[PDB]
Symmetry: D3
Subunit: 241 residues, 6 copies
């Protein structure tokens, strides 16, 4: 093991320079199974890694877990092993009424409601996605025929108060986030999730390419509590290889 957390050596990657990075370890095998020669690499904490082949070239699929801190460990240690391009696939809650459950979202940049991004760049720095990655993700969605939305995502360190949920133990949301959902909605923000700000900032400020795609699992204008994207991200990876 060349790294402290992932349990991987540089030789494990077989010259791979691109990684797909889901949140849930459960999803890693399913993503790799859509490519050639899939083999299990390692599994430690919420970091499950698999190696696959796409058009003759080595590809990594590795999970991040929930949150920026966990994400920052996986990205850093993957970068040490040779990864220069990261493609993020996740799940999300829509906050705009016209976006339906089943729709696919591509993130251009993130509202930094996290702490981990500040460990790489000050708040004035933008949490922006790589242009080539974003293009590839939009072209892939277009070829597959998925109903897709491009724009800004709010990336939060919490599931509950930072996304202004009141259905909680305290039923309370601190001053900073009181009335914040209505504010993001007016600013044209598409959705909430919990990892992109960290991923995007840390890659953009360190010479690493990153992209972000996600499937909608809930619409917050209706409820607080609740496939194509998987095909989109692997198709995008083919154009970036």
């Amino acid at each position: 093991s060349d790294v402290f957390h992932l349990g991987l050596t540089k030789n494990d990657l077989q010259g791979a320079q691109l990684a797909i990075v889901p949140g849930d370890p459960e999803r890693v095998e399913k993503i790799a199974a859509l490519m050639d020669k899939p083999v299990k690499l390692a599994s430690h904490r919420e970091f499950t890694s698999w190696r696959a082949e796409l058009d003759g070239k080595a590809v990594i699929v590795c999970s991040t877990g929930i949150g920026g801190p966990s994400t920052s460990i996986a990205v850093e240690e993957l970068a040490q092993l040779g990864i220069r391009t990261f493609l993020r696939i996740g799940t999300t809650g829509a906050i705009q009424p016209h976006i339906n459950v089943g729709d696919v979202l591509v993130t251009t940049a993130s509202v930094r409601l996290d702490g981990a991004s500040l460990h790489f760049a000050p708040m004035e720095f933008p949490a922006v996605a790589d242009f080539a990655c974003t293009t590839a993700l939009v072209e892939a969605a277009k070829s597959i025929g998925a109903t897709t939305h491009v724009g800004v995502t709010a990336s939060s360190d919490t599931f509950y108060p930072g996304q202004e949920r009141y259905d909680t133990y305290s039923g309370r949301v601190v001053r900073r986030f009181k009335g914040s959902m209505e504010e993001w909605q007016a600013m044209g923000v598409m959705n909430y999730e919990m990892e992109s700000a960290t991923l995007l900032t840390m890659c953009a400020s360190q010479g690493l390419r990153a992209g972000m795609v996600a499937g909608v699992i809930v619409n917050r204008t209706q409820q607080e509590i609740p496939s194509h994207a998987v095909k989109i991200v692997v198709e995008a990876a083919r154009r970036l290889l």
Copy 2:
């Protein structure tokens, strides 16, 4: 007439939905002359406005002057008159050694070293360009065959201390900005300019499409102070967005 600064009516625009927004009033007519049926509309302070036609469709060219404050006035008042798409063309000082004078840069997002962006969105909101605008801009630069870099820009409220210039009256730089250039360079930042953070934040937070393009006029790794394809690029990009 309809607006306080620009001196324009909705009728002056004749249906225009897109605007090209340079900084210098003197470049406004030059950009308009590259398109069909160029007509001068008005001229007040920083704001010189022209109407032209591109593929039979009305287009506005309006100057912003230097800085986010005056840019925010032009953008706001054009939006009241019906503009929904804004394209900035400017000039810039590169901070990466591999970028030469005359190269073209396309901004995906800006480092917010301004004050006016905060009047539209809190600091954690990204100063990000619209994707369709950026695509057109990158595809236009490639069609004309320009040497092109795509990435992040540092957008500063000042020409001197905020860009870490020491050849000044005082010769000093405040704590915040001392050592900041080396820091931006290490973070992959391409260039310094003075307007993008304001333009990009106020558009992305109000449902307005915005893109940013600039020609390199100086490189900071050698000196503090010093037809371009940039103008051809912005006009070709505007064509694709109408």
Copy 3:
């Protein structure tokens, strides 16, 4: 030619160490006309410069444009050329009920609602006027007999959201400035403006003397925008010329 934006040399100034700095370029020559031996120096972007003579002493008149960014270029490059004392003349929106259109407002210090002032001093540092410049402006106003108000000014990086104007495209104001005008009013702030915070912070933190004066064109307790007119206020112009005289 000695500077990058203003297109001037030290020779153009002919020994000048005081400059009057209006916002609008079209005001430069009109201000210069009230003084002896006026001549046009240069004009680039929003920097229009004229030289005049007051009691046999060389004085510069140079525009700044709208906003602190272009103000900071003008003030810096003028300082490089030899200017050590700056007097700003502008227009303003009053936020107190008793202040009338055409009243003259002299600023002691400014609420830093700008970004450029942070490029010279951290937010703790006061955006304060020079005492000698303020004295000259106050004493000059009394000599003219204008209705004068002295106090704090809020200096915003925007005309619209930062001055809590709602009649806009979005009709929306961000959390920070929502309810802000009522708060400044209660705190005794006289007016809204867009350049003083940058100017005063620049000069005070770099050993330069600065004064700030402006004439009211709208009262924000009744309307956001002044009514349009056709006919072609000047009190503040006389006051700023007379104040310079007392400073030379």
Copy 4:
């Protein structure tokens, strides 16, 4: 299931009001084994939960995973199910010369270098542990005879830059965290971890009781990476004094 992530009902807890919350899911079984009638409950994402008994009273053991965001999810959802007292156990890197590998550290409060704590309370509010919980941990430690240090912890959203590690892909650290380890060291800060700031802030501002204990895994005065027990006994003994 009564909660969204954990996959637990109120009936699963059997009236439990106290939870031991390790970082690593692997530890859940081991901590539960030291108590009686231990049984598995659920496992979803980084949240593995067990239930046991201590002096005839039900106790929960539930993992949080790495970081404040994940910690905040577990703590909130356990609170909805009835948990009022939280005792965290983790691993940590020491930054004081007089603190060695294998020593046990009890946190009174944390330096807030996270983002999740701000979602509960503004920065001025202290990430402070409950006094009853801290007392139980200190006293449990002295009865086992472990080398114990009591004080402030640095709680970071990152393992690398925020803890000022330079053996990285970029080799640089951002302005804010550059020269920061030396500063914390002069301030009397004991150690580095990643979850206590979030945990202590969200409990102290919501009427919940919380304590924090960890074992020293690396000394940062001599090395960045560790490689080149007592705490588990202490946390179980502390919980026993809290029921």
Copy 5:
């Protein structure tokens, strides 16, 4: 003769003392020193009055701070130079919780930092936390005396009026930051308001000094009955007996 700029004390004055009790009021010093053996006045300059007394045969200092973090920081710093390593603050306070009664005793584990002087020792993310041994001694000493005691968080404010959301003032207005603040602190479980615990606890914790904080509740801001002078000084005395008794266990 003085070893320090403000306090007017020497190391000889201390007689080898390593603990100090640090109240706010100059006039309270003599009264607290009256609960110990053989008290003698040492000095009195500005708001800083100092006395020495014996406790179980050990030298102890009692020295006032004045109101606020700035004057507290001067006193604590200059005492530390003279050789003091442990500081125990006794105060009076206003409770903001309905279940906390006038006459109750409050021990602070840590403080909400609404001061400016703590920032001169550590940035805002550092906790304004009490020393464990000092808090242990205070909680246990409270049981010896028999007080009704609450242990938790305290809001430490640089002002008595607007920072404690008081509206009965000259202006009658409260700045944006503090408008609605009392209600929010109440929800977060904050017990009370005072004016110096944030400075003291931050400056000691970040400099290798031990500090503790105890106070008696003189008023509650949720109820309408305001106690008289006699009942208030009865509460103060009750909390004063706890700080001396806690000091015994810290020698």
Copy 6:
């Protein structure tokens, strides 16, 4: 016996007074009032010693503030509750500019807000600015007295040691924020360090009260760290005479 909770004064005690001189040292209060007509001791509670005097037939207050903004804010507010509308501060200070001598007098136009109490009245972007009429009277009073006077910006700190970048302390340690800070204020033309002006100036300017600040230099920090009726106390009395 008292209309206010800290000072121990009634509105009646002020006898119509609308101006107060507000020094820092309680012991110094009596000596200032002794320079005026019919001085009478009023009260003494905590760090607040108050005396009443007369100047050209008008009642004036001299009241002690104690050290620091918090203590200052209590005095100003309760004095305001009893009718005082004009405050004049007289203090001692440490100069940080080479050209300023020990014994010189400094009039403050505005302060660097290195405090916490000012934020309880106005956000940080609000200027800690003195009243123009008060500053004028102080500047003119200096001429009449005949002292060497400098007018400008003052750094107003919540501490005496770390915030004034002093290293001769127990820890010998200065926090990141204030590391190298004295050299920075110096280059920004800041005259001096004190501990009360930011709170005083901000709270008065944002509440419709008039305030002024004068001080005598007791030490120069470019030569020395620790220091060791004056001109400044004469100037504050003369200024008060001009503002009645």
